[PDB]
Enzyme design. Structure first.
Site, PDB file in Angstrom:
ATOM      1  N   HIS A 163      84.419  14.785  35.282  1.00 57.34           N
ATOM      2  CA  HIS A 163      83.061  14.546  35.772  1.00 57.34           C
ATOM      3  C   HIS A 163      81.941  14.818  34.753  1.00 57.34           C
ATOM      4  O   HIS A 163      81.001  14.026  34.642  1.00 57.34           O
ATOM      5  CB  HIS A 163      82.813  15.413  36.993  1.00 57.34           C
ATOM      6  CG  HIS A 163      83.765  15.166  38.117  1.00 57.34           C
ATOM      7  ND1 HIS A 163      84.836  15.988  38.373  1.00 57.34           N
ATOM      8  CD2 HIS A 163      83.799  14.198  39.063  1.00 57.34           C
ATOM      9  CE1 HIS A 163      85.495  15.537  39.426  1.00 57.34           C
ATOM     10  NE2 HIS A 163      84.883  14.454  39.866  1.00 57.34           N
ATOM     11  N   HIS A 207      84.073  24.403  39.009  1.00 54.74           N
ATOM     12  CA  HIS A 207      84.138  24.934  37.646  1.00 54.74           C
ATOM     13  C   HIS A 207      83.327  26.225  37.404  1.00 54.74           C
ATOM     14  O   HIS A 207      82.586  26.691  38.280  1.00 54.74           O
ATOM     15  CB  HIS A 207      83.688  23.856  36.655  1.00 54.74           C
ATOM     16  CG  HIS A 207      84.585  22.657  36.608  1.00 54.74           C
ATOM     17  ND1 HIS A 207      85.951  22.736  36.769  1.00 54.74           N
ATOM     18  CD2 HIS A 207      84.306  21.350  36.394  1.00 54.74           C
ATOM     19  CE1 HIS A 207      86.471  21.525  36.673  1.00 54.74           C
ATOM     20  NE2 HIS A 207      85.495  20.667  36.444  1.00 54.74           N
TER      21      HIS A 207
HETATM   22  C1  LIG Z   1      89.756   6.624  18.237  1.00 57.00           C
HETATM   23  C2  LIG Z   1      90.227   7.458  19.419  1.00 57.00           C
HETATM   24  C3  LIG Z   1      89.553   8.833  19.452  1.00 57.00           C
HETATM   25  C4  LIG Z   1      90.485   9.883  20.074  1.00 57.00           C
HETATM   26  C5  LIG Z   1      89.780  10.759  21.104  1.00 57.00           C
HETATM   27  C6  LIG Z   1      90.723  11.262  22.197  1.00 57.00           C
HETATM   28  C7  LIG Z   1      89.912  11.809  23.376  1.00 57.00           C
HETATM   29  C8  LIG Z   1      90.468  13.094  23.995  1.00 57.00           C
HETATM   30  C9  LIG Z   1      89.367  13.866  24.734  1.00 57.00           C
HETATM   31  C10 LIG Z   1      89.736  14.234  26.174  1.00 57.00           C
HETATM   32  C11 LIG Z   1      90.512  15.551  26.284  1.00 57.00           C
HETATM   33  C12 LIG Z   1      90.022  16.428  27.441  1.00 57.00           C
HETATM   34  C13 LIG Z   1      91.128  16.891  28.393  1.00 57.00           C
HETATM   35  C14 LIG Z   1      91.055  16.214  29.745  1.00 57.00           C
HETATM   36  O1  LIG Z   1      91.419  16.804  30.756  1.00 57.00           O
HETATM   37  O2  LIG Z   1      90.558  14.850  29.862  1.00 57.00           O
HETATM   38  C15 LIG Z   1      90.946  14.032  30.977  1.00 57.00           C
HETATM   39  C16 LIG Z   1      89.771  13.754  31.930  1.00 57.00           C
HETATM   40  C17 LIG Z   1      90.064  14.297  33.333  1.00 57.00           C
HETATM   41  O3  LIG Z   1      89.734  13.329  34.328  1.00 57.00           O
HETATM   42  P1  LIG Z   1      89.869  13.722  35.890  1.00 57.00           P
HETATM   43  O4  LIG Z   1      90.793  12.709  36.533  1.00 57.00           O
HETATM   44  O5  LIG Z   1      90.217  15.200  35.961  1.00 57.00           O
HETATM   45  O6  LIG Z   1      88.376  13.480  36.486  1.00 57.00           O
HETATM   46  C18 LIG Z   1      88.080  12.505  37.500  1.00 57.00           C
HETATM   47  C19 LIG Z   1      86.606  12.126  37.442  1.00 57.00           C
HETATM   48  N1  LIG Z   1      86.325  11.261  36.260  1.00 57.00           N
HETATM   49  O7  LIG Z   1      89.512  12.346  32.018  1.00 57.00           O
HETATM   50  C20 LIG Z   1      88.719  11.790  30.924  1.00 57.00           C
HETATM   51  O8  LIG Z   1      87.982  10.868  31.207  1.00 57.00           O
HETATM   52  C21 LIG Z   1      88.780  12.295  29.490  1.00 57.00           C
HETATM   53  C22 LIG Z   1      88.098  11.329  28.523  1.00 57.00           C
HETATM   54  C23 LIG Z   1      86.577  11.352  28.641  1.00 57.00           C
HETATM   55  C24 LIG Z   1      85.937  10.330  27.704  1.00 57.00           C
HETATM   56  C25 LIG Z   1      84.828   9.516  28.373  1.00 57.00           C
HETATM   57  C26 LIG Z   1      83.521   9.516  27.585  1.00 57.00           C
HETATM   58  C27 LIG Z   1      82.915   8.118  27.475  1.00 57.00           C
HETATM   59  C28 LIG Z   1      82.345   7.612  28.798  1.00 57.00           C
HETATM   60  C29 LIG Z   1      81.376   6.453  28.578  1.00 57.00           C
HETATM   61  C30 LIG Z   1      81.663   5.288  29.522  1.00 57.00           C
HETATM   62  C31 LIG Z   1      82.946   4.518  29.200  1.00 57.00           C
HETATM   63  C32 LIG Z   1      82.721   3.007  29.320  1.00 57.00           C
HETATM   64  C33 LIG Z   1      84.014   2.192  29.382  1.00 57.00           C
END
Ligand SMILES: CCCCCCCCCCCCCC(=O)OC[C@H](COP(=O)(O)OCCN)OC(=O)CCCCCCCCCCCCC
Length: 259
Positions: A163, A207
């Site tokens: 979130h 949280h």
């Molecule tokens: C070149 C590649 C680069 C490598 C980078 C790798 C990224 C790793 C970073 C994430 C690690 C954190 C640990 C984690 O628990 O992430 C998972 C997270 C949990 O999601 P939940 O299901 O718990 O939540 C539901 C509500 N959304 O769910 C997630 O969404 C985590 C990812 C969040 C990133 C989103 C940010 C951008 C949003 C902009 C809109 C997107 C448009 C398409």
């Protein structure tokens, strides 16, 4: 360092304020809040939760493409890179499902009320433990069905704030990319929203403010990296000269309008 990432840093700071504050103030979640606030927090939370949350992201994505249109190639790349990170993040997520043990705030109140000592509770199989929270919930009549389910869905394991990472990132992309584009109404809303989301996490007892600060910081990291790739790959996201004279035109067109 770069001008685009100066602004994301300022955003990162701004979003850290609320949660750092609350962290410092040493406020902890107790039950029995005014249930309009629980529900209003729930909706704010829901603007990111995956049933309705797809709308928000699509509209923002669209809107962002609209605003970034002079660098529309650069934008698609950037959003692809974040769509990647999401799926990496979903790979990362699965690995954590059994590692985390830290409880959500509502779990502490819940073990007090069921007279289970802190000592016994944590001397349990991680699985047997997190189930007992799940089973204890469906026997509690205290809290309304919509929150109980969320608590069940979330599980009272303090998994990193999905979130907050999402909401914060949107707001960091705003100050990051749109500040020079005079998107003052946009930026503002996303900052308010992101924080409303962070705050709504705290109000539900999902949280601790550490989590929101970590989550905020992950976003700062992620956004700054994603923007850099898109820059090195597809060239600048900063407005070009075509974009500025259009902007500088609209300034002088608004003043001269009164005449
Ligand atoms: C070149 C590649 C680069 C490598 C980078 C790798 C990224 C790793 C970073 C994430 C690690 C954190 C640990 C984690 O628990 O992430 C998972 C997270 C949990 O999601 P939940 O299901 O718990 O939540 C539901 C509500 N959304 O769910 C997630 O969404 C985590 C990812 C969040 C990133 C989103 C940010 C951008 C949003 C902009 C809109 C997107 C448009 C398409």
């Amino acid at each position: 360092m770069r001008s685009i990432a100066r602004r994301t840093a300022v955003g990162a700071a701004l979003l850290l304020v609320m949660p750092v504050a609350v962290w410092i103030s040493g406020w902890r979640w107790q039950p029995g809040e005014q249930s309009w606030l629980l529900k209003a927090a729930f909706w704010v939370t829901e603007t990111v939760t995956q049933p309705w949350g797809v709308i928000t992201h699509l509209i923002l994505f669209g809107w962002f493409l609209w605003c970034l249109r002079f660098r529309i190639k650069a934008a698609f790349v950037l959003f692809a890179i974040l769509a990647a990170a999401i799926l990496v993040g979903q790979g990362v997520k699965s690995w954590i499902k059994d590692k985390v043990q830290e409880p959500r705030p509502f779990v502490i109140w819940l073990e007090k009320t069921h007279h289970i000592p802190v000592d016994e509770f944590y001397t349990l199989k991680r699985a047997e433990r997190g189930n007992l929270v799940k089973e204890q919930l469906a026997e509690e009549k205290n809290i309304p069905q919509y929150l109980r389910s969320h608590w069940q869905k979330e599980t009272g394991f303090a998994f990193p704030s999905g979130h907050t990472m999402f909401a914060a990132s949107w707001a960091l992309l705003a100050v990051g990319l749109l500040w020079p584009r005079r998107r003052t109404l946009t930026i503002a809303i996303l900052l308010v929203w992101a924080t409303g989301v962070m705050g709504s996490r705290l109000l539900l007892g999902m949280h601790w403010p550490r989590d929101l600060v970590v989550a905020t910081l992950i976003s700062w990291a992620l956004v700054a990296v994603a923007t850099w790739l898109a820059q090195r790959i597809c060239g600048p996201l900063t407005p070009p000269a075509e974009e500025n004279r259009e902007i500088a035109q609209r300034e002088q067109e608004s003043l001269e309008h009164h005449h």
